[PDB]
Design a protein around this ligand. Structure first.
Ligand code: PC1
Ligand code: PC1
Ligand code: PC1
Ligand code: PC1
Ligand code: 3PE
Ligand code: 3PE
Ligand code: 3PE
Lengths: 112, 344, 80, 168, 113, 71, 172, 96, 96
């Protein structure tokens, strides 16, 4: 029953330590002028974040290579079986189904 | 590019062959889950600001359509805990099957869709492929066939063949006019379905042919009704006797084959001593005919040939298997008391 | 063609080390006779509990006392 | 339902820890096999471990005299043997390997036992049939009756398809 | 029926077969013989008799296929019947023998004008 | 051996969870002593709620959740 | 740490949703999930299924969501907001929250009320186990690795993914 | 017992006004990609509390598409707001 | 239309995961396993349209093995035979 005793112990030191740092001098009596001088060294910066694509694909591109290496995960439990040939013949398919899915897209990464 | 377009366009039917071949509820998920995955790029090809505001109104309307099903698969995994494919053992399953499956076919409601997609897909080439998705689902309903609440599958039917009928009388674009009156013929085949479920397929094949041979004809340039006026005095008149030898046969008149489904279907729906149902269907497909008349008063009346329009060239499209179909879309009535005993 | 195979190895000698290992792991499992030992060991590990069958007449083999002569030789491994 | 009384209960359970219970545990079963394999067959062969309690007191019994045996001859090497294996985690058998002889010095020798290395708990054995081999399987209510078949000698169609008119 | 996904089983040996000169087989490919004549006319052939190599190979196709298909149709109406009598024969309790009697017995309505 | 210890532990366990039930009340709109919730008759391994009653204090919590979350 | 530590997770889970099932300015949408996903992977880690729980962290909650969050800088909303501050979002909330609460109140606040909510007893986890057992990797989903019997189940999923990229190499 | 009525009230997450609407489509698409876990967990119990031992892979296959496919339909939502910059379900243009 | 190819030729596509009792690789059972081989034995030579009005007995308890739907109610109704009377005598049990 002692796991949650070992988790909420950990946060409660951390969720404590924000206030004893952030908050404690935050109410101190120093000046702290409201002037809009903050947001350093790009003073104003008025724009939307524009869509920039080769930022985007490197999200998608991963998400799919991700899946099957969940599918690929239960090899070391499956190395203990009865008929094993249906493993080696089958196990090696996923991989090559992964590696193929590279080679195609590999004609165009662009600047990744 | 050109190879894969035959890899994609092959994987579709492989998406629907695992549907008809399977014993196992999971596979009929995966089965038509990978259409909504593998259909989408076909819409695209010319990358326009409709297809992309089309297939996204399609997508999330076949996304839930599926994703409810998986909720009505896992209900009767609780009760009886035996998958396979048979009556659903529990009423919250079926009522969550059939009226959430009517989304892919769309029936009486669940169509604000079929006109929003079929219209304005920039690709009219086909769009004949939206005759697959009529053929994936039915290949469930034939199996589950002895479980339905039976007060529903008629209540989506009879509110359909009506609502798809009136839908078009107001229409001009002739991609819509086929979009409409393709809800209609989903009124006959799932109205039958609890009584003797073959003599449905009969209406299913006679439908796949007739709507098929329309499009292949609508492919030369043809788009808007008033571009089918500039047709006979320009392209070829042997085309016009065709478009009048079908559009009439498709609502149907007894010397043609379009009369073949009704003529047989009512042999079935009476003999079960329901004679107050079929008239209202029988009589409502009537004002389903007044699209086609008044479509057919466009092309034989020599209406203001377009302008000085001189097409001296010959044709090089693919008419493939059009030189057959309106000898089988018309003349087959004289032939067959097979269709009830052939596919059975 | 060997001039090619030496003129990709002056430029990208990287993936070539992957192909060189890509095959050579596919080929060999159909060769060395050490394999198929691998399938015998892995079948004989008693995960479950052996249940004694009923003996009326035959009873081909395998007497009541296990250490008596009973059945196959698995001790080709113990010496291995 | 019928359950036996509170009686033929409160019997003598072998009360020992789980470290000693795996100490010998090995010479134990390979040499006994008088009730126990047979006692399985009073379960697997016929289920409902209620109808079969009897050998349960036989198989529980074999242990009693076993640990009662060993206490007479040598408990000294045993007591020291299951101490190491009881020095703990996982209860490995590969730490106490040295002392394995000291326990087994005269046990296999004096009172005449043997080390049943890999042949124990394998080589699916047999027992014997003493109790009636039960018919009337577990639940087993009724058949019920199937469909009479159809083959005969056939025909072509009688008058030809009898649809509406459509002679042939 | 049985031997599933067979165009026709081995049991169709005992049927006539449907040999030629039946009006349909002639008619089959007639509707193709009026098909061929179309095949020219769409493109502005403008022959109305064009190459006999297109103006034939249709008629060859239909009647072959029309034939090769009629061989099973007639079959199917036989296996339909076959499975009926053999059921009608047994369960005679579901199949009475009606008696014989009419005149001097039955009254009708009797409503003249 | 190990099993022939358990089967006795549950049959002992049902009786006390019956004999100490049937002596709670015998009610006229009550239940017969030790009926069956099924029609069929054979020995079907009982549900946790059978062995431990509404007792539901601690030694239960160390039974059902005993193995999970830790040694 | 009572016997109710399961029932206390789900009713946080059920409340995990209604945060983002209304309309929260979807940079807080995530924070309606990773709580729900978290507590979700929480519930599953009871019952004995473990491997299958600890994956949702790896394959979905950890891996997937980040893409859902790596965008919504590309679709980036104009000037985000703390949800429930508004009058548009706040109105829809509570009536959901109470609807299970008022359900959860007299669902059983008494002996039974009434029938349809009365056939679910509580508190011992009556079903939550059976008897004892032996061990295989555990017993249950301990053996989730079948490259034996399952094959035609993989080779569709194995092949259906390979096309996932081709579709997306285009429209991109 | 009770854990089957939660989570179920959770699987009415559909709620459809909040399934297509209102704008910030990303909120709609969101409650979709989390419509799972109501399908998953619910089917990670009934499989588990009784030992099926076999369908146990099915939970895995309920994600592997639910991520694969729902990650597709994200793509379009770039094409919409690429040409715009605001998703805003309020684009109707193709009409009927 | 359901072709059933895996009947004609030899392959097994699925047919194994299908029901609650088939193999379970190490031969480990389910809880309600023993009622399958009971209930399938009932309707096999049947054509299933009379099954519903024929067997129905071996099915119902099987549905009541699965969910424990009733035994949980007759159980919850011991909490009303005791634990309204706690003060009125027969604490029940004596501990231990
Ligand atoms: C007329 C439109 C409606 C057709 C209804 C069916 C009429 C044909 C039925 C003939 C008798 C029969 O039972 O068929 C089996 C008969 C059985 O053969 P039979 O021994 O009875 O020979 C009689 C054939 N007739 C009556 C034509 C002399 O086989 C046939 O179908 C005959 C082949 C010709 C059938 C069609 C002939 C074309 C005439 C109509 C042309 C225009 C129609 C519209 C097309 C557009
Ligand atoms: C039957 C099973 C389901 C078939 C329904 C329709 C299948 C059509 C598949 C290809 C259609 C297509 O895209 O062609 C467009 C293409 C044109 O596309 P395009 O003009 O936009 O550009 C062509 C681009 N390249 C060069 C790459 C091809 O071809 C044609 O112009 C001809 C149309 C096809 C004719 C229809 C084929 C069958 C027609 C009768 C069907 C009979 C069925 C039997 C009934 C029993
Ligand atoms: C197809 C034959 C495979 C079996 C061959 C039997 C092995 C025996 C020894 C083979 C010797 C080498 C054979 C040809 C080598 C290819 C030479 C070449 O230029 O092709 C690379 C060509 C040349 O491409 P390139 O001209 O654009 O140069 C770029 C190369 N890199 C990537 C280093 C920058 O590139 C490719 O298309 C390779 C992409 C496919 C990647 C597949 C990775 C391997 C996955 C495991 C399989
Ligand atoms: C690996 C096989 C690939 C199968 C894919 C074939 C594509 C199917 C596309 C269907 C188009 C719509 C037409 C449906 C009518 C089917 C006709 C038919 O069932 O006859 C099959 C025929 C005969 O069918 P049958 O009478 O023996 O049994 C099936 C009949 N149904 C399907 C109606 C129950 O099969 C053959 O052997 C002909 C060769
Ligand atoms: C002799 C054939 C007719 C006389 C010459 C044909 C002239 C011609 O090319 O016109 C085809 C004409 C199509 O009609 P339309 O397009 O309205 O007229 C303008 C076309 N110049 O008419 C057509 O040919 C259209 C084709 C219709 C089907 C073929 C019928 C044509 C008649 C000749 C063959 C008849 C064979 C039928 C035999 C008995 C079957 C009933
Ligand atoms: C039969 C059995 C099989 C037989 C196989 C035979 C042998 C095959 C095995 C070889 C594989 C070794 C590892 C893989 C190859 C090394 C990785 C590689 O390919 O680097 C290629 C890199 C590309 O550079 P280039 O193509 O020239 O383009 C730039 C031009 N301006 O060119 C480079 O040089 C990049 C260098 C690395 C980049 C990072 C280096 C940063 C410093 C880190 C070094 C520390 C690592 C040392 C290892 C510590 C180990 C404890
Ligand atoms: C009624 C009885 C039922 C059975 C029907 C059997 C099918 C009849 C077979 C003949 C079909 C004719 C045809 O295939 O298309 C006609 C034409 C090809 O004719 P051809 O002689 O090759 O002229 C070539 C000149 N370039 O082709 C063209 O017009 C354009 C060239 C395309 C060739 C396509 C060849 C397809 C052959 C098999 C077609 C099967 C699908 C038929 C569609 C309807 C089926 C109901």
């Amino acid at each position: 029953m002692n796991l949650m005793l070992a988790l909420l112990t950990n946060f409660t030191l951390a969720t404590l330590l924000v206030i004893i740092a952030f908050w404690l001098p935050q109410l101190n009596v120093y000046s702290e002028k409201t002037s809009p001088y903050e947001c350093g060294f790009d003073p104003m910066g008025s724009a939307r974040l524009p869509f920039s694509m080769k930022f985007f694909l490197v999200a998608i591109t991963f998400l799919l290579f991700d899946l099957e290496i969940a599918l690929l995960l239960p090899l070391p439990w499956a190395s203990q079986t009865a008929n094993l040939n249906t493993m080696l013949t089958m196990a090696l398919f996923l991989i090559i189904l992964l590696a193929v899915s590279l080679a195609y897209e590999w004609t165009q990464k662009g600047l990744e | 590019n050109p190879i894969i377009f035959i890899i994609i366009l092959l994987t579709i039917m492989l998406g629907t062959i695992i549907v008809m071949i399977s014993s196992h509820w999971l596979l009929v998920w995966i089965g038509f889950e990978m259409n909504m995955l593998a259909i989408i790029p076909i819409m695209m090809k010319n990358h326009n600001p409709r297809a992309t505001e089309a297939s996204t109104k399609y997508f999330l309307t076949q996304s839930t359509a599926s994703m409810l099903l998986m909720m009505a698969v896992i209900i009767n995994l609780m009760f009886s805990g035996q998958w396979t494919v048979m009556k659903l053992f529990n009423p919250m399953a079926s009522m969550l099957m059939t009226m959430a499956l009517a989304m892919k076919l769309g029936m009486a409601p669940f169509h604000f869709w079929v006109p929003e997609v079929t219209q304005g897909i920039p690709l009219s080439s086909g769009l004949i492929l939206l005759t697959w998705q009529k053929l994936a689902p039915m290949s469930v309903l034939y199996q589950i066939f002895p479980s339905i609440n039976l007060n529903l599958i008629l209540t989506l039917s009879v509110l359909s063949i009506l609502i798809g009928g009136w839908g078009g009388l107001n229409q001009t674009q002739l991609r819509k006019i086929m979009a409409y009156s393709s809800i209609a013929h989903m009124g006959w085949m799932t109205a039958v379905l609890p009584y003797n479920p073959t003599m449905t397929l009969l209406n299913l094949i006679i439908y796949i042919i007739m709507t098929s041979t329309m499009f292949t004809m609508f492919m030369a340039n043809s788009t808007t009704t008033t571009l089918s006026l500039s047709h006979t005095w320009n392209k070829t008149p042997i085309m016009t006797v065709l478009i009048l030898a079908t559009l009439l046969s498709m609502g149907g008149l007894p010397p043609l084959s379009g009369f073949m489904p009704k003529w047989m279907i009512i042999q079935e729906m009476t003999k079960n001593n329901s004679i107050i149902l079929p008239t209202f269907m029988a009589i409502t497909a009537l004002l389903n005919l007044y699209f086609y008349m008044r479509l057919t008063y466009s092309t034989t009346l020599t209406m203001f040939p377009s302008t000085n329009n001189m097409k001296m060239k010959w044709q090089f499209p693919l008419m493939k298997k059009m030189t057959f179909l309106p000898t089988m879309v018309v003349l087959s009535t004289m032939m067959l008391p097979l269709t009830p005993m052939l596919s059975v | 063609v060997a001039a090619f195979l030496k003129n990709v190895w002056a430029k990208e000698p990287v993936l070539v080390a992957s192909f060189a290992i890509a095959g050579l792991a596919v080929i060999l499992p159909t060769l060395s006779p050490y394999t198929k030992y691998s399938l015998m060991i892995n079948r004989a590990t008693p995960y479950n509990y052996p249940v004694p069958l009923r003996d009326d007449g035959n009873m081909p083999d395998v007497p009541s006392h296990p250490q008596d002569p009973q059945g196959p030789s698995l001790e080709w491994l113990k010496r291995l | 339902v019928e359950l036996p009384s509170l009686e033929d209960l409160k019997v003598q359970e072998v009360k020992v820890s789980s470290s000693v219970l795996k100490a010998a545990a090995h010479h134990y079963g390979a040499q006994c096999d008088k009730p126990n394999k047979e006692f399985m067959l009073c379960r697997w062969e016929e289920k409902d471990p209620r109808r079969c309690l009897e050998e349960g007191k036989l198989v529980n019994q074999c242990a009693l005299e076993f640990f009662r045996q060993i206490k007479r001859h040598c408990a000294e090497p045993f007591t020291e043997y299951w101490t190491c294996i009881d020095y703990s985690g996982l209860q490995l058998f590969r730490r106490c390997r040295k002392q394995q002889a000291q326990f087994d010095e005269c046990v296999l020798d004096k009172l005449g036992w043997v080390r049943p290395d890999l042949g124990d708990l394998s080589k699916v054995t047999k027992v014997k049939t003493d109790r009636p081999l039960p018919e009337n399987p577990y639940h087993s209510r009724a058949r019920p009756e199937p469909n009479p078949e159809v083959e005969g000698d056939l025909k072509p169609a009688r008058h030809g398809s009898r649809l509406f008119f459509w002679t042939m | 029926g049985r031997a599933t996904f067979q165009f026709l089983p081995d049991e169709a040996r005992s049927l006539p077969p449907p040999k030629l000169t039946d009006p349909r087989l002639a008619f089959v490919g007639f509707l193709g013989y009026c098909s061929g004549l179309i095949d020219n006319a769409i493109r502005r052939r403008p022959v109305l008799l064009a190459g006999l190599h297109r103006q034939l190979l249709y008629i060859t196709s239909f009647v072959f296929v029309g034939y090769y298909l009629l061989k099973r149709q007639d079959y199917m109406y036989a296996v339909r019947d076959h499975d009926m009598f053999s059921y009608i024969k047994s369960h005679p309790e579901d199949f009475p023998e009606k008696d014989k009697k009419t005149y001097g017995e039955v009254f009708e309505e009797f409503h003249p004008v | 051996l190990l099993q022939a210890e358990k089967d006795r532990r549950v049959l002992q366990m049902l009786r006390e969870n019956l004999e100490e039930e049937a002596t709670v009340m015998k009610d006229v709109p009550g239940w017969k002593v030790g009926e069956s919730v099924f029609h069929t008759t054979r020995w079907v391994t009982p549900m946790m709620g059978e062995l431990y009653g509404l007792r539901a204090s601690e030694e239960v919590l160390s039974a059902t959740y005993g193995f999970i979350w830790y040694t | 740490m009572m016997l109710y530590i399961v029932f206390i997770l789900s009713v946080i889970f059920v409340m995990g949703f209604v945060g983002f099932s209304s309309k929260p300015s979807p940079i807080y949408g995530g924070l309606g999930l990773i709580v729900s996903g978290g507590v979700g992977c929480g519930i599953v880690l009871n019952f004995g299924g473990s491997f299958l729980g600890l994956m949702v962290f790896l394959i979905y909650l950890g891996g997937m969501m980040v893409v859902f969050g790596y965008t919504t800088a590309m679709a980036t909303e104009q000037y985000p907001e703390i949800w429930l501050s508004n009058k548009a979002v706040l109105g829809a909330f509570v009536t959901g929250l109470l609807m299970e609460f008022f359900m959860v109140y007299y669902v059983l606040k008494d002996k039974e009320v009434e029938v349809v909510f009365e056939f679910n007893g509580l508190g011992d986890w009556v079903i939550y186990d059976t008897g004892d057992s032996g061990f295989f990797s555990e017993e249950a989903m301990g053996i989730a690795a079948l490259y034996s019997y399952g094959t035609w189940l993989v080779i569709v999923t194995g092949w259906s993914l390979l096309i996932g990229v081709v579709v997306i190499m285009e429209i991109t | 017992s009770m854990v089957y009525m939660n989570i179920m009230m959770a699987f009415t997450v559909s709620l459809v006004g909040l399934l297509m609407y209102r704008s910030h489509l990303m909120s709609s698409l969101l409650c979709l990609e989390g419509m799972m876990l109501s399908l998953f967990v619910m089917a990670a119990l009934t499989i588990l509390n009784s030992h099926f031992t076999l369908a146990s892979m099915m939970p895995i296959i309920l994600l592997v598409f639910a991520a694969c496919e729902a990650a597709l339909g994200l793509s379009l939502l770039v094409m919409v707001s690429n040409t715009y910059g605001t998703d805003y379900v309020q684009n109707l243009n193709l009409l009927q | 239309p359901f072709f059933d190819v895996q009947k004609r030729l030899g392959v097994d596509l699925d047919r194994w995961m299908t029901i609650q009792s088939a193999e379970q690789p190490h031969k480990i059972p389910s809880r309600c396993h023993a009622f399958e081989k009971e209930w399938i034995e009932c309707a096999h030579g049947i054509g299933s349209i009379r099954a519903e009005k024929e067997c129905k007995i071996e099915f119902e308890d099987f549905r009541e093995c699965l969910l424990r739907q009733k035994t949980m109610k007759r159980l919850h109704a011991i909490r009303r035979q005791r634990e309204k009377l706690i003060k009125e005598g027969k604490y029940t049990p004596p501990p231990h």
